[PDB]
Amino acid sequence: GSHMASLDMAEIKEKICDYLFNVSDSSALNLAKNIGLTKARDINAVLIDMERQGDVYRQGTTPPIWHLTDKKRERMQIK
Ligand SMILES: [Cl-]
Ligand SMILES: [Cl-]
Ligand code: NI
């Protein structure tokens, strides 16, 4: 919920990266449905931390839809 340095949170973060990059942009609710419903609070915590760092952004309110940022995609893809 805070333990961003744990193996467990690194695994949730890569599952989020994998989904947002290879599947699509997503609500947090849909990420939990795909990654594991019992991990919703850690998914929310990782998204908030990635947002603070400019690696994802949220779009809209009901619910917000999470997207990879251009800064993050530039580390992953060619222009
Ligand atoms: Cl990542
Ligand atoms: Cl990836
Ligand atoms: Ni934590």
Curated annotation (Swiss-Prot):
Signal peptide: none annotated. Induction: Isoform 1 is induced by interferon alpha. Isoform 5 is constitutively expressed. Sumoylation reduces RNA-editing activity. Coiled coil: none annotated. It comes from the Eukaryota. Disulfide bonds: none annotated. Ubiquitously expressed, highest levels were found in brain and lung. Isoform 5 is expressed at higher levels in astrocytomas as compared to normal brain tissue and expression increases strikingly with the severity of the tumor, being higher in the most aggressive tumors. Residues 7-70 form the Z-binding domain. Catalyzes the hydrolytic deamination of adenosine to inosine in double-stranded RNA (dsRNA) referred to as A-to-I RNA editing. The third dsRNA-binding domain (DRBM 3) contains an additional N-terminal alpha-helix that is part of a bi-partite nuclear localization signal, together with the sequence immediately C-terminal to DRBM 3. The presence of DRBM 3 is important to bring together the N-terminal and the C-terminal part of the bi-partite nuclear localization signal for import mediated by TNPO1. RNA binding interferes with nuclear import. The first Z-binding domain binds Z-DNA. It is linked to Dyschromatosis symmetrica hereditaria: An autosomal dominant pigmentary genodermatosis characterized by a mixture of hyperpigmented and hypopigmented macules distributed on the face and the dorsal parts of the hands and feet, that appear in infancy or early childhood. Aicardi-Goutieres syndrome 6: A form of Aicardi-Goutieres syndrome, a genetically heterogeneous disease characterized by cerebral atrophy, leukoencephalopathy, intracranial calcifications, chronic cerebrospinal fluid (CSF) lymphocytosis, increased CSF alpha-interferon, and negative serologic investigations for common prenatal infection. Clinical features as thrombocytopenia, hepatosplenomegaly and elevated hepatic transaminases along with intermittent fever may erroneously suggest an infective process. Homodimer. Homodimerization is essential for its catalytic activity. Isoform 5 can form heterodimers with ADARB1/ADAR2. Isoform 1 interacts with ILF2/NF45 and ILF3/NF90. Binding to ILF3/NF90 up-regulates ILF3-mediated gene expression. Isoform 1 and isoform 5 (via DRBM 3 domain) interact with TNPO1. Isoform 5 (via DRBM domains) interacts with XPO5. Isoform 1 and isoform 5 can interact with EIF2AK2/PKR and UPF1. This is Double-stranded RNA-specific adenosine deaminase. It comes from Homo sapiens. The chain holds residues 294 to 366 of 1226 of the full protein.
